[model samples]
Every structure is written in C-alpha cells, then in structure tokens.
Target: EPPLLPARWSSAYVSYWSPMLPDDQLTSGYCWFDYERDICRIDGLFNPWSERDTGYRLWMSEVGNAASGRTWKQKVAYGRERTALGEQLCERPLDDETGPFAELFLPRDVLRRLGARHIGRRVVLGREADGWRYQRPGKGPSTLYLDAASGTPLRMVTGDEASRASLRDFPNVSEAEIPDAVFAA
Candidate 1:
C-alpha cells in the first residue's frame, strides 16, 4: 500500500557514509516541516571534521524565501551561534527539488514522480517500514524506506560501492505543528 504523507511533522536524523566510517563522520540533526505552508528547516552538525565546530542551518519557504547559515557553539555562549552563510531570493518558488534538503523532507509527490517500485516491507530500527526502489538521476538506483503507518522516511540508501551514502536513521519523529518563529531569520 502507498503511504500517506503528512502536512506537518518533525524529526531528528542521522546520516553517515557507511557503518565502517568513524563516529565523527556522521551528521546528526533535527528537521521541521510544514508542507501546508511550504516551509521547512534543517539544522545539524554537518561538518565531518572533528576539529571543526561549524555546523549548518537552513530555512526555506515558498513565500518567505530561503537562507542558510553556519552554526557553532562557543565556550561562553548560551547556545549555538548563527552567522549568515547565504540567502536566495525567490527567483523561483520552493519546489520538490528545491535543494538537497528536500531529500530529507521527502516531498509529497516524490514517489509518484520517481516512479518508485514497491520493494516490499522491512523492519527498520524495530519499526515496520515500506521499501521502495527507484532510479535517481545522476545518483543511480536507490532505496527509500518509509514508516509504514506515517509515511515518514526512515532511511534512504543511495549509490553503490565506495560512493554510497545512507541516511542511517530518522528517529524521534513527531506530527506536531511547527511554529512560524522557527523559520524566522
């Protein structure tokens, strides 16, 4: 059965190159989505270098535009500091393929557009998930696993051989509403 995508939700995700890679090579972060408003945010420690404190944060909305910044924690700072990294005016409205971050959010029409083939079911992180395989242009064939009941993407495996990339796990997912302030710069 096809999974039903949600309009609002959030989750914490961990992405890594491969299980053989060192711990510091993984990225852990949180993401918020409000598809109804065509807005979302993803913030995480994306820098793989152990010596670097820099992380990344991005916010995009169809109406408000898009921006990204560097995030870092300082010894005396109360929380992570954000410095403007870049911004994009809406020369084009946010779309399913707006950015790489869209992969994490999984746009509602993605499966249909990708012509994904149902590859059956599997248990991921102890939860039942539906598997789908599709050929991603430039990236080649890949598999996406979604929470069977909620349609939230639990994992994605892209590529083969040494170039493989995997969204190791998506945890602590919530169907709660996201506040507008979260998208504010």
Candidate 2:
C-alpha cells in the first residue's frame, strides 16, 4: 500500500519542468487518475522547443483530455492556429488550468493532488540520501521523497528545490491502462 494513498493513480513516467520553460524547454509523460471520477488523463510529449511556445502555439501531443466534478469536459489539444498545421483542439476551462497548462501536472499528479489536500499534515522527515522524508505545510512548503523500498512517490520539491518545478518518477510503466480514447477525445 505504499504509504497508503491511492484512490486511483497511474503515473507511467512523469517528469515535469517549468520555471516558465524555454531553457531546456521541458515536459514529460503519462498521468491517469480516477479519484472517484474526477478523472484526469494527460498524455505525454511536449517540449518541442520553440521556447515551449508559452505564446500558445501549443501542439505538444501524445494526447490530452480533461474532466472534472460531476461532469465537465475539455479536450485541450494545447493550441496552434494562425495557419494551423497540427494539434489544435482548445476547449479550455477546468479553471483554465493556468500558465502553460499548469505546467502539465506530473510529479505523481502533484503528489496525488497533494495527498488529497495535505494528507492530514504529512510529516515524516526521517531517512535521507534520496528517499523517505516528508513534510507538509500550506501555500509554500512541501517536500517528499519516498521510495525506501516501495513507498513509491519519488521526488517532489516545492518553493525551494532550486526554485520550484521538481518532480521525477521514472523506470517504466507502473499503473497505466487507460484507454477509451483517453476520455473519448
């Protein structure tokens, strides 16, 4: 039960990066959650350069989809117009998913949505050397490592992990089996 938190999750490869992107222009992959149907499916591939197109020339695909609450839909193909050529399906709304589409989640979908909101003030801060250490506070303090032999969640840093955007979980498939055209996109 790896830290016992999983209503539903499938992080095939997460990686994430931002800082407003562009330097190395990053992005990562896979993400699926069904937290009882709040449903979230994020297909991969991004960072095709061109300054990660924060100007919204979008077109980063593997696929993309969105759903929230009782029922609301989105098929945000991430932009591209003005003589479009590919990937152009914007129907944004899900709170508009702010800037660069909220940096495209990952990092275990933001620690499974921050353990569904501060897993009762997570606090471990034990082991180190790259695993098992946790912390939780509001608005600006969050840290997690977990993996000392299957606690899963590998890496997450908030506020000061060299300036935000830190999430890494690799190796290969974990719990990915979502299909149905990824939310019927």
Candidate 3:
C-alpha cells in the first residue's frame, strides 16, 4: 500500500526555527496545497529578514496569467550560486523540491513518495523521550525526529545545528477543498 497523504487540506500553518543561524531565523507562515492539481500558494516570511510594511508575502507558481508566474525553478535559479542547497535544488525536478511542497511534507515523506531507499540508518534504535530519532549515518549525519503517531517530522539536526517545524492548524483536513482563488495570480 502507498502512503496516504492529506487528500484535502484547505491550508496549514507552519512554524520553523533554525538554530544554526546567528540571528533571525524564526519563520511562521501559511501555505495552501492541492496535490491533485499540483498547485500551491504561500504567504510567508522569515521574521527580522522581512519587511514589516509589506504585510503578508505571497508566492505562487504559474497562475493562468502569463504576466505572473514565479515557479520554484525560478527561486532555485535566483539563489543557485549563493547557496549549496540552492544548487542542489536546481539539479532536481522543480515540482519535486519546492518550498511550499517541502513545507507540506517531511524529508522522509519525500523519500517514501518516490520509493527511494532509506540510505541513512536509524541511529536512535527506537523512540526517544520526544520521538524516534535517526541520523543520516554519513559525513553530514543530519538527524531527524518524527511524531510516532502521524509520522510527521518534529525536528532536524546536523552538526551543531537544528531546525524545527510544527503544524499549527488542520481546520479543513479533508472536509473542504482549497479554492481556485488561492492559487490565482
């Protein structure tokens, strides 16, 4: 049997923190995703790094209008030379490694979706105080923890740093479908 993804979720709130950065890495935002349509919209910000007067910052890929289309591929291209992650992203399928897509799923989830083998060995051996832990079992040894019940990720760690993301809302959870306007230009 295949993994069951949230079939119908109107939107979700996500909060994440990256301790690796010296300052201003806390981010909280909302994203709407419809796997069926391959559509997504995000109004988000990384605090202190964002402009206050702009209100919510929205990002969306190819709305029907040719005038407005900023897909994840563009984002990767923009930052490709600036960061290693960005370069890695440009090497993969754009839809397969998007911010909104990532915000909606965990690293394990992606691996499972593509039927990829789990390269990293489970380091924790079992559940920890908070959740099950696993290290990538390699040079970087990125560690990850997931909710025991839902398999949703709880935190990620590598070297002396870590980043965490928590789901805050599941209001429509299969009860309603995301509207077309949400992905419009």
Q: Name the top TM-score candidate.
A: 1
- Candidate 2, overall lDDT? 0.44
Looking at candidate 3, the ten consecutive residues that score lowest on lDDT are 73-82
TM-score of 3: 0.41
Q: What TM-score would candidate 2 get against the native?
A: 0.26
Q: What C-alpha lDDT values do all the predictions have?
A: 0.60, 0.44, 0.37
Each candidate structure's TM-score, on Cα atoms with residue i matched to residue i, is 0.64, 0.26, 0.41
Tell me the alpha-carbon RMSD of every candidate.
10.2, 14.0, 12.4
lDDT of 1 at 105: 41
Residue-by-residue lDDT tens digits, candidate 3, 15-44: 434442454344555555565655555554
lDDT of candidate 2 at residue 163, scale 0 to 100:
77
Off by over 4 Å in 1: 1-4, 22-24, 47-105, 161-163
At residue 135, give the lDDT of candidate 3.
39
- Candidate 2 residue-wise lDDT, 123-177, digit = tens: 2233321332334446565555554544545445544455765555543425445
Instruction: Write model 1 residue lDDT over 129-163, tens digit each, in one string.
Output: 99887777766877788898878878777655245
Error at 22, model 3, angstroms = 4.0
